[PDB]
Amino acid sequence: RIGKQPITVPANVAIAMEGQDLKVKGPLGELSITYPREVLVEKQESGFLRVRKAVETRRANQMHGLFRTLTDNMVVGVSKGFEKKLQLVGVGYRATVEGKDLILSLGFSHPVRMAIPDELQVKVEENTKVTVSGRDKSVVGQFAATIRSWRPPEPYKGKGVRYVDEVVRRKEG
């Protein structure tokens, strides 16, 4: 059910457990998440945390799986790191990086200057397709969604900022 999970913590990954808190100090960043109430973890004498619902209800059962896989996103975050991929399909459409900014050429009257934050290391290895990388999967999310949310792909066109390997309905007219 995912309620029961084994926390795979590889080497290099400090699991700083504190009273309703986890500070992971991993080789790529020190990510920090607080526990909810019913969800109680203990390190299980190996590099494997176990969140264990303390009080019996359904809301506990809810956040058991929830927070279990939150921590999993933390660990895999700092160690393996998250990627993300986009593809500015079409005429004209092309992006380029200005170190701290990501400027987009999307057929608008004006190029769209998406100033990125620091937590996110983006790049354009091929003039069309974009690449985002980051430590925390949520932030990577809001960012890639944001980039998509300027020219989400059109059906007929078939051809906008469709992040990689995402299915795109198409039509005749």
Added chain:
RNA sequence: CGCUGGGUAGCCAAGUGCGGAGCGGAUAACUGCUGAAAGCAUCUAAGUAGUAAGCCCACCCCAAGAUGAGUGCUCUCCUA
């Protein structure tokens, strides 16, 4: 004021001057991000992003009778 022409100030306009803003914060519909309940999924249950002439502040004018009667820098006299 007989009827007419012309007219300063005033008041007027069909004249002139300016004005509806970087606004910023929450939102509704909606699109989302991470994600289990439900060993897939789902915008949601935890938490977060965007976003409307709509809401609030901003703008402009009153306003401490706001009896909850505010604030302070000056005054005014202690001789019966």
